[PDB]
Write an enzyme that holds these catalytic residues in place. Structure first.
Site, PDB file in Angstrom:
ATOM      1  N   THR A   1       0.584  -1.483  -0.015  1.00 37.29           N
ATOM      2  CA  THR A   1       0.123  -0.030  -0.065  1.00 37.29           C
ATOM      3  C   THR A   1       0.654   1.355   0.013  1.00 37.29           C
ATOM      4  O   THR A   1       1.217   1.640   1.179  1.00 37.29           O
ATOM      5  CB  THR A   1      -1.642   0.213   0.032  1.00 37.29           C
ATOM      6  N   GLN A  40      -1.901  -8.978  -6.899  1.00 37.73           N
ATOM      7  CA  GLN A  40      -3.206  -8.121  -6.692  1.00 37.73           C
ATOM      8  C   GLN A  40      -4.121  -9.262  -7.060  1.00 37.73           C
ATOM      9  O   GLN A  40      -5.277  -8.916  -6.596  1.00 37.73           O
ATOM     10  CB  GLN A  40      -3.118  -7.236  -7.863  1.00 37.73           C
ATOM     11  N   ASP A  43      -7.197  -9.831  -4.819  1.00 35.66           N
ATOM     12  CA  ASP A  43      -8.158  -8.857  -4.516  1.00 35.66           C
ATOM     13  C   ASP A  43      -9.523  -9.263  -5.141  1.00 35.66           C
ATOM     14  O   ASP A  43     -10.562  -8.588  -4.674  1.00 35.66           O
ATOM     15  CB  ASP A  43      -7.761  -7.537  -4.969  1.00 35.66           C
ATOM     16  N   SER A  73      -9.912  -0.813  -2.903  1.00 31.91           N
ATOM     17  CA  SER A  73     -10.473   0.133  -2.013  1.00 31.91           C
ATOM     18  C   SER A  73      -9.549   1.425  -1.907  1.00 31.91           C
ATOM     19  O   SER A  73      -9.984   2.204  -1.258  1.00 31.91           O
ATOM     20  CB  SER A  73     -10.408  -0.714  -0.700  1.00 31.91           C
ATOM     21  N   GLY A  93      -4.070   0.376   3.594  1.00 27.49           N
ATOM     22  CA  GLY A  93      -5.062   0.064   4.564  1.00 27.49           C
ATOM     23  C   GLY A  93      -6.061  -1.154   3.909  1.00 27.49           C
ATOM     24  O   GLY A  93      -7.001  -1.588   4.655  1.00 27.49           O
TER      25      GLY A  93
HETATM   26  C1  LIG Z   1      -2.410  -2.165   0.359  1.00 25.49           C
HETATM   27  O1  LIG Z   1      -3.269  -1.185   1.556  1.00 25.49           O
HETATM   28  C2  LIG Z   1      -1.199  -2.597   1.030  1.00 25.49           C
HETATM   29  N1  LIG Z   1      -1.630  -3.567   2.056  1.00 25.49           N
HETATM   30  N2  LIG Z   1      -1.974  -4.242   3.366  1.00 25.49           N
HETATM   31  O2  LIG Z   1      -3.380  -2.803  -0.101  1.00 25.49           O
HETATM   32  C3  LIG Z   1      -4.404  -2.320  -0.787  1.00 25.49           C
HETATM   33  C4  LIG Z   1      -5.483  -3.010  -1.638  1.00 25.49           C
HETATM   34  N3  LIG Z   1      -4.649  -3.951  -2.575  1.00 25.49           N
HETATM   35  C5  LIG Z   1      -6.586  -2.452  -2.590  1.00 25.49           C
HETATM   36  O3  LIG Z   1      -7.529  -1.990  -1.751  1.00 25.49           O
HETATM   37  O4  LIG Z   1      -6.397  -2.195  -3.554  1.00 25.49           O
END
Ligand SMILES: *[C@](=O)([C]=[N+]=[N-])O[C][C]([N])C([O])=O
Lengths: 190, 350
Positions: A1, A40, A43, A73, A93
């Protein structure tokens, strides 16, 4: 992040939130490029109803698919006052990025806190699932009894986020604040 | 009077997680670059000094608002590989394998950072790519001192993944241990990549040498990112999601991010309360806000997805009427179990 904000002399502003997802991503460097590769793909909703690393859930809307951009997010955000860019913020976060940015905005508008005060204030968060009122250290023992009482299941935990913000005065003056939660960071200007 | 004081500046300002990167931003502004130029330089600088999250192999979002009010969002989020499939992360029993979605070569999406930065830089910047990448290039070539943040992250999180891959370990590990505070981190290979990007532009990444290196890394290990994927990748400028809270307009990221939509949704909900009256840290304020958030995350799990693939009911979600109907289901002196909360009925708001 990680999130960073910028405002130049002309008053142009940019807020950027980018990442590899988890810290160092997969930890896999792509050959001899020296570039770390993201994870990623986590996610996405690997399976409808099953939570990912951040406890976030999805269905067909966020299911894995070719050439599809997985749900995020991240919230680089800009607030405008009297028609002019006023607050530039954001934060890492995962799922907490949403309530973290929200508190920055509420702290600024409703409680009239300066960007540093708004930044150093303690934070809380609820993402429906899991069902709990996650909090940071800093909230009174008293106020916390009422949440438990009123009905909430308070759950003290790790610090949330790393806001890097800039507030713009009506006269062009700039006010900035880096998060106490992140060490070695910096807000500077000229 | 105040316990906390903001840093002050009269001309330009940069706020970031790393001192070196921030300073890179400021220097670019002092050289006459605009907010976007500084932002790209900072982004490349972080890809070197903050390998934890700063990157060239990841993705993200960017919100740009010109001095004239024009507000826009750049979506440089990663695209799953063309050969990616719905159940790709399921084991033989049909259960999600976290290891596969977090540590294997299958966890990676086609990176969009180089793309997003170049799009923003070409359309909204004023400096050539070679100029804004130079600061990061020198940092990778000549190295920098490992500070507490990096040292702590390398030990705590790096240990679980970095030493498991030969090329990664060769860069971040020293004498069988993660680099320590005070050590120097030089990234020769990254410097070459950065040097090539600054010369051949973003294609160096999506079509050039770097693309080749990424493709081979995947092929030889079971990954899916191919040269076609990297060539078929593109950053996408999209309309920011926005709302109005007590006279202030708020702008955030639209889908693929769920960020924008839900921040606005919750603010709409909160607008129905005299938050100022309760005050910060008060029992009530925390009460109201905690509940409002629940509905939002509920809706998130259902309505949010790549807009290029699914239709998101963003109008209804940010509709004040809906927000007001969510507000009523809130009791200042009693909560509501997440179980007794489901994705709202957006029908009368469509
Ligand atoms: C980041 O806050 C890194 N961490 N723990 O993650 C972001 C998440 N991949 C997003 O909401 O895209």
């Amino acid at each position: 992040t990680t999130h960073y904000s910028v405002v130049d002399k002309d008053g142009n502003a940019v807020a950027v939130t980018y990442t590899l997802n988890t810290t160092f991503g997969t930890g896999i460097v792509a050959g001899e490029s020296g570039i770390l590769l993201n994870n990623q793909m986590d996610d996405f909703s690997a399976k409808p109803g099953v939570p990912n690393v951040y406890g976030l859930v999805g269905g067909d809307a966020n299911a894995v698919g070719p050439n599809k951009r997985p749900l995020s997010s991240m919230s680089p955000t800009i607030v405008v006052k009297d028609g002019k860019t006023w607050l530039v913020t954001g934060s890492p976060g995962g799922s907490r990025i949403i309530t973290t940015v929200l508190q920055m905005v509420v702290n600024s508008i409703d409680y009239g806190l300066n960007v540093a005060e708004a930044t150093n204030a303690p934070r809380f968060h609820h993402q429906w699932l899991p069902d709990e009122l996650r909090v940071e250290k800093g909230f009174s023992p008293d106020t916390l009894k009422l949440l438990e009482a009123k009905g909430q299941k308070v759950a003290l935990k790790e610090a949330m986020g790393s806001t890097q913000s800039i507030m713009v005065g009506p006269d062009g003056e700039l006010y900035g604040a880096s998060d106490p939660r992140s060490v070695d960071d910096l807000t500077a200007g000229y | 009077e105040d316990v906390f004081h903001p840093v002050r500046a009269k001309q330009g300002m940069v706020a970031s997680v790393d001192a070196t990167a921030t300073q890179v931003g400021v220097d670019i502004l002092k050289e006459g670059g605009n907010a976007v130029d500084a932002a790209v330089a900072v982004g490349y600088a972080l890809a070197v000094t903050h390998p934890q999250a700063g990157n060239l192999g990841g993705g993200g979002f960017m919100l740009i608002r010109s001095k004239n009010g024009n507000t826009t969002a750049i979506d440089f989020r990663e695209m799953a590989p063309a050969k990616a499939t719905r159940d790709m992360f399921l084991d033989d029993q049909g259960n999600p394998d976290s290891k596969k979605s977090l540590t294997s070569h299958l966890a990676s999406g086609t990176p969009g950072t180089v793309a997003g930065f170049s799009l923003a830089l070409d359309k909204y910047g004023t400096m050539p790519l070679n100029k804004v990448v130079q600061p990061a290039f020198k940092l990778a070539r000549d190295g920098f001192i490992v500070n507490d943040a990096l040292a702590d992250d390398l030990k705590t999180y790096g240990s679980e993944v970095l030493p498991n891959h030969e090329n990664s370990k060769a860069i971040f590990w020293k004498e069988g241990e993660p680099l320590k505070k005070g050590d120097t981190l030089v990234q020769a290979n990254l410097a070459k990549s950065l040097e090539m990007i600054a010369e051949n532009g973003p294609d160096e990444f999506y079509k050039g040498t770097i693309a080749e290196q990424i493709a081979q890394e995947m092929q030889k290990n079971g990954g899916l990112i191919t040269k076609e994927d990297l060539a078929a990748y593109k950053a996408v400028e999209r309309t920011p999601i926005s709302g109005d809270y007590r006279g202030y307009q708020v702008y955030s990221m639209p889908p693929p991010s769920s960020g924008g939509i839900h921040i606005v949704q919750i603010l709409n909900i909160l607008e129905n309360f005299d938050m100022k009256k309760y005050g910060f840290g008060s029992a009530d304020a925390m009460q109201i806000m905690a509940e409002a958030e629940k509905y939002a995350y509920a809706d998130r799990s259902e309505y949010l997805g790549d807009p290029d693939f699914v239709k998101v009911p963003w109008q209804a979600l940010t509709n004040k009427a809906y927000a007001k109907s969510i507000a009523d289901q809130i009791d200042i002196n009693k909560a509501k179990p997440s179980s007794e909360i489901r994705p709202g009925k957006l029908a009368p708001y469509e």
